[PDB]
């Protein structure tokens, strides 16, 4: 497998006390598998809010108010040798989901809700994947760190992404740092009598986690 | 009390002048910088990234499927599958790429390009395909023989699932030369496998690509 | 002709891609006797020619030079004193023509006549973070810079209608985390809202796939 | 989500056709923990 | 945001706490033909925005830069000659428009037109003691600095009503013996008199002692 | 008065208040009538190596 | 007779400018300073 | 206070603080008292147990008649935390 | 703030003056020169 290091930098600790668990948070958290079909559109995940409800990392990230960590990504998409198609997996720093409407007035223009901007541990699907639901075309989305999951070459991708933010510490509750996007550029095709849908599994690991300011509930 | 005289150009406000101004807050120190990953320095770092060309820009097509070349079966040898131009700063497939959006802010460009193809299809399906570059002057060839007399790569669907052809030196001040894409033999397929696949085309610049004279763009219909 | 040589590599950097004195603001003024003051909270996202060039990146850091060019309704040179006032982020805006906000020493002021060369000031990096960012995914224009209030210096009143332009030039600009260029049209100022229906393609159509149109 | 917060292995059906999870120290004098 | 870094330590000193060209004086002038001269004995205790910042200390020592900005009733640029005159402490004030005090060579004068940039002069430390002090416990404004008389240069008369502003900037300031900041309102200029009744508390009230209001 | 230099390839202004008079890429010079005459400098702006007033071959 | 030109910002009065002015009394020396106890330098001495 | 009057002339501040208590009472009277700091986010605790789970000092009225608790790093750009 | 005075000849536009002007395109580099045969330097090469 080939590892594409995001922006050519390794996630490191903060330069000059914030805690470092290093034992129970650096474990492979595995999300539920996504069902890729013929008429699918794509999926996106806001990262520091995917693991805010999952075990010790969620506990130690909700009970604090400072936060800085990286992530070691892993996207396994195993299909049979007769299926065909291609996926584009990519990370996007500060991936702001836009609203779909035709209003210029401020208080009546549409805006995405809490569940649309922050999907949680289940993710969310696209509505107009040609514009990334942000008015930005997908043809040049390769400017981000990315991999092609081609169903005739490999079935895995890894994106070791560092901490991308203007301030070295931030709250992990009201600010989703960066998002993951998986988009089926080439649709799924298969003959009759095969598996109708393909599973997509994502496992992530919070490399170099740092929390600050314990707060009792 | 040194004597002095004023020359023409006094009290004029030149737009592109490199002149300093008096600071508003003296002594105020700004926020110190931290090491933010991904610092860019010039736009030539942005031109060297692969980007999906929109070669299927014909009508009666939806949004995404304009990025896919339909390499189907039920066809024949020495057949034209797909062809397109090379000009980045021109209305066509090169308008959807990133080098085609960057090279329009400037008015002159030069250097070589690189077009990389990728076959999205089954693993059990194979078949040979002739990609062909025809330089400026002479137009798109009509038959496979004239295409293989020019620049050509015979790329099969074996282990090589991503071929890359370098386009030499195509510049601004100019027809432009055509990239043609021909069925070499067929698209053979075993049973229990669809006989219809796709090819994603991508294109980027090289280290020789350089730019000069920056002007306004026209991808904006607003003010 | 035929460009066989290589071109310059200095006019492609960010320092030359941004440092040029464009236009950002147009401010009016009536001074009937009928507001005489003219506030303008600065945002570089006003025009759609710099917003498309600045939303290409995620993080930016720069200093600014502002040039104020004031003309009359038709355009004359009546030598009247004018006061520009920089309201830093957090300071209260002026409410009237002769309010006490126009006398506080903390808000820097520039006194210039109409017959004089246009005014020019320099504003440094004024953000609490390490750099500006135009995409804040989480929970007034983004990235507060400060107001540029203006009024005419007089005691009773005046009977002219000024019209001024504010030209901004960026300098010492640094960029981080590039991102693709927005192709869809704009709908708001502080939101990247596009239209669900009527999606414009990134390339104008041709006849078929087997031509050279 | 609660399962992946505990101990977990995300095993795909790629080249790895036989995964192995070690169960730590489970003893006699005791619920017992669930796989 | 979240300020996790440390901020600047240069903009907290006294040299940056005082050195900024604020406003101190506003002077009128009618010149009917009806006093034309306009005396103004300078005191830095005029406004209540610098008095609160200067009564925070007991002893001070500084030089001053004064800028004179003169406009018309509405504001014009009639190119008329104006004479500013500095009357040092002890020298007699001018009594008329054409008195002999306006001809003595010892009182320095500044001749400026209305079309010209505003006038600017510098006044050094002019106290007989070692430093100024705004609290003299023992037995005209405190700490004599000197007058800044002004008139229009003409022979017979003029028929305009000037209106000028005097902006003062402190420089090379040194302080001694700090003291608390006055919270009660003011009643006089040269006396720290407060009100016996109606004593304003130094903190606005809340509901109870067991909340977070 | 506003003078505006339109480099080769840039579109010409069409009206008095057209958007061509606001684009930042076209350098402008603001001068009054009472001021000394305006003076600017234009460098070598040809794609070839030098100008030529006799082009034997095929504004 | 050196040639010179004026740029934008001429004849403007910036409030926060660090510019010197011509003295009114030249040659006049002020009163010498003595050692007065309690000299403060920054406001951070008052916050502590 | 004085730091509250100085820090209003400026618009941004940072750093740690120090709150010192002093008991004015009889010498023959004693008794224990729990001072407690609760950082930003979570609000004032309702019961003593939640307060002693946070930051706390158990100061008695013995020889120590003046306790001092340091408040860490509370800054401008923000609830604020309760003492 | 150096003191200065203006002498006669201020704000005049002399035709044959050897005075530089502010460039319009800063940082723009022109096309490099090649060795073109037949370079002339003075008109005395044409009189011979």
HSE at residue B99, side-chain half, CA atoms within 13 A, is 31
Residue A85 CB neighbour total at 10 angstroms: 26
Number of domain units in chain B: 1
- In the 3-class helix/strand/coil scheme, how is H29-72 assigned residue by residue? CCCEEEEEEECCCCCCCCCHHHHHHCEEEEEECCCCCCCEEEEC
Which residues, other chains included, contact B32 with Cβ-Cβ below 8 Å and sequence gap of 6+?
C130, E5
CA distance linking residue B113 with residue B169, whole number of Å: 7
CA distance linking residue E108 with residue E94, whole number of Å: 13
Instruction: Quote the tokens at residue B67.
Output: 């990025």
CB contact under 8 A, H41 and A65: yes
CA distance linking residue B15 with residue E30, whole number of Å: 44
3 state SS of C206: coil
Residue of B nearest to I30 (CA): B212
Give the distance from CA D23 to its chain's centroid.
7
Its domain, for residue B205, covers: 1-223
Hey, is the C-beta of B13 within 8 angstroms of any chain G C-beta?
Answer: yes
3 state SS of E198: coil
DSSP code, position D3: H
- In the 3-class helix/strand/coil scheme, how is A1-67 assigned residue by residue? CCEEEHHHCCCCCCCCCCECCCCCCCCCEECCCEEECCCCCCEEEEHHHCCCCCHHHHHHHHCCCEE
Burial profile B81-93: b = 16 or more Cβ within 10 angstroms, e = fewer? bbbbbbbbbeebb
| Residue for token pair 């909700």 | A62
Instruction: Quote the tokens at residue C68.
Output: 């104020």
Please answer whether residues E111 and E119 qualify as being in contact, where contact means their C-beta atoms are separated by less than 8 angstroms.
no
Residue G10 CB neighbour total at 10 angstroms: 16
Residue F34 CB neighbour total at 10 angstroms: 9
Instruction: Quote the tokens at residue A160.
Output: 């070791």
What Å distances lie between residue C136 and A109, A178, B20, F27, CA to CA? 19, 10, 32, 34
Hey, is the C-beta of B220 within 8 angstroms of any chain A C-beta?
Answer: no
CA distance linking residue E93 with residue C78, whole number of Å: 36
* Torsion of the alpha carbons at B134, B140, B146 and B149, rounded to the nearest 10: 0
Handedness of CA B26, B30, B32, B34 (dihedral sign): negative
Strand B2-6 versus strand G2-4 pairing type: parallel
Instruction: Quote the tokens at residue C85.
Output: 């006032």
Residue of B nearest to I2 (CA): B1
Please answer whether residues C65 and C122 qualify as being in contact, where contact means their C-beta atoms are separated by less than 8 angstroms.
yes
What Å distances lie between residue B170 and B87, B148, B178, CA to CA? 8, 20, 11
HSE at residue H14, side-chain half, CA atoms within 13 A, is 11
Tell me, yes or no, whether chains E and F touch by having 3 or more C-beta pairs under 8 A.
no
Instruction: Quote the tokens at residue E184.
Output: 């009660």
Instruction: Quote the tokens at residue C91.
Output: 């300071």
- Tell me how the structure was determined: cryo-EM
Q: Which residues of A touch C187 (CB under 8 A)?
A: 101-104, 109
CA distance linking residue C170 with residue C65, whole number of Å: 7
CA distance linking residue F26 with residue B15, whole number of Å: 9
| Residue for token pair 């100022």 | C189
Q: Which residues of A touch C202 (CB under 8 A)?
A: 137, 139
Handedness of CA B44, B50, B51, B53 (dihedral sign): positive
Burial grade of A217 (CB within 10 A; 0-12, 13-18, 19 or more): exposed
Please answer whether residues B163 and B179 qualify as being in contact, where contact means their C-beta atoms are separated by less than 8 angstroms.
no
Residue of E nearest to B24 (CA): E20
Residue A216 CB neighbour total at 10 angstroms: 16
Partners of A44 in the β-ladder:
A124, A181
CA distance linking residue H39 with residue H81, whole number of Å: 4
C-alpha distance across the termini of chain I, in Å: 58
Nearest CB to A7; choose among B38, B96, B124: B38
Number of domain units in chain A: 1
Its domain, for residue A188, covers: 1-217
CA distance linking residue B84 with residue E184, whole number of Å: 82
DSSP code, position C118: P
Backbone dihedral region of I38: left (phi > 0), alpha (psi from -120 to 50 degrees) or beta?
A: left
| Cβ–Cβ pairs < 8 A, chains E and G | 81
Measured in angstroms, the resolution is 3.6
Nearest CB to H40; choose among A65, A216, A217: A65
Write down the H helix ranges in chain B.
44-47, 99-102, 144-149
Residue of C nearest to I34 (CA): C5
Instruction: Quote the tokens at residue B34.
Output: 């931290």
Tell me, yes or no, whether chains C and A touch by having 3 or more C-beta pairs under 8 A.
yes
Give the distance from CA C190 to its chain's centroid.
14
Please answer whether residues F35 and F3 qualify as being in contact, where contact means their C-beta atoms are separated by less than 8 angstroms.
no
């Amino acid at each position: 497998a080939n590892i594409v290091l995001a922006y050519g930098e390794w996630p490191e600790y903060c330069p000059d006390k914030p805690t470092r668990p290093d034992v129970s948070v650096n474990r492979f958290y595995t999300l539920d598998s996504k069902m890729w079909q013929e008429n699918s559109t794509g999926w996106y995940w806001k990262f520091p809010d995917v693991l805010n409800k999952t075990g010790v990392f969620g506990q130690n990230a909700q009970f604090h108010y400072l936060y800085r960590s990286g992530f070691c990504l892993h996207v396994q998409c195993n299909a049979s040798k007769f299926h065909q198609g291609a996926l584009l997996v990519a990370v996007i720093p500060e991936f702001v989901i836009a609203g779909r409407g035709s209003n210029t007035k401020p208080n009546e223009a549409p805006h995405p809700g809490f569940t649309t901007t922050f999907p949680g541990t289940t993710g969310a699907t696209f509505h107009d994947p040609y514009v990334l639901d942000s008015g930005v075309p997908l043809s040049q989305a390769l400017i981000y760190p990315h991999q092609w999951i081609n169903l005739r070459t490999n079935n895995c991708a890894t994106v070791i992404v560092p901490y991308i933010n203007a301030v070295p510490f931030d709250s992990a509750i009201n600010h989703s740092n960066f998002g993951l996007i998986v988009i089926p550029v080439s649709p799924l095709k298969y003959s009759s009598g095969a598996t109708t849908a393909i599973p997509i599994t994502i496992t992530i690991a919070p490399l170099n986690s740092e929390f600050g300011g314990l707060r009792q509930a | 009390g040194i004597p002095a005289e004023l020359r023409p150009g006094t009290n004029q406000f030149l737009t592109t002048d490199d002149d300093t101004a008096a600071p508003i807050l003296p002594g105020f120190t700004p926020t110190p910088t931290i090491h933010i990953p991904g610092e860019v320095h010039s736009l030539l770092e942005l031109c060297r990234v692969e980007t999906i060309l929109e070669v299927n820009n014909t009508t009666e097509a939806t949004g995404l499927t304009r990025l896919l070349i339909p390499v189907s079966s039920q066809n024949k040898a020495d057949e034209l599958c797909a062809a397109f131009m090379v000009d980045p700063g021109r209305i066509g497939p090169w308008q959807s790429t990133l080098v085609g959006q960057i090279c329009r802010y400037y008015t002159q460009w030069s250097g070589s390009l690189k077009v990389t193809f990728m076959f999205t299809g089954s693993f059990m399906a194979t078949g040979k395909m002739l990609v062909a570059y025809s330089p400026p002057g002479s137009a798109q060839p009509a038959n496979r023989e004239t295409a293989m007399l020019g620049t050509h790569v015979i790329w099969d669907f074996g282990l090589q699932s991503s071929v890359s052809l370098v386009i030499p030196w195509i510049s601004n001040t100019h027809t432009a030369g055509v990239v043609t894409l021909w069925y070499q033999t067929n698209y053979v397929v075993p049973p229990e496998t669809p006989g219809e696949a796709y090819i994603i085309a991508m294109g980027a610049a090289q280290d020789n690509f350089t730019l000069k004279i920056c002007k306004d763009t026209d991808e904006v219909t607003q003010q | 002709r035929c460009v066989v040589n290589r071109n310059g590599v200095l006019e492609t950097t960010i320092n030359h891609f941004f440092s040029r004195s464009g236009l950002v603001g147009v401010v009016n003024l009536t001074d009937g006797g009928t507001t005489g003051y003219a506030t303008w909270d600065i945002d570089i996202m006003g025009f759609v020619q710099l917003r498309r060039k600045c939303e290409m990146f995620t993080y930016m850091r720069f200093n600014a030079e502002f040039t104020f060019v004031t003309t009359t309704k038709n355009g004359e040179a009546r030598p009247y004193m004018l006061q520009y006032m920089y309201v830093p982020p957090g300071a209260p805006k002026p409410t009237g023509r002769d309010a006490f906000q126009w006398q506080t020493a903390t808000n820097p002021s520039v006194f210039v006549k109409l017959t004089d060369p246009p005014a020019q000031v320099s504003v440094p990096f004024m953000s609490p973070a390490s750099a500006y960012q135009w995409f804040y995914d989480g929970y007034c224009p983004n990235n507060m810079m400060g107001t540029f209030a203006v009024r005419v210096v007089s005691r009773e009143a005046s009977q002219l209608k000024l019209q001024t332009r504010v030209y901004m030039k960026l300098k010492h600009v640094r960029a981080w985390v590039p991102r693709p260029i927005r192709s869809q049209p704009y709908l708001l100022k502080n939101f990247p809202n596009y239209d669900s229906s009527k999606i414009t393609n990134s390339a104008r159509d041709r006849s078929s796939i087997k031509q050279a149109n």
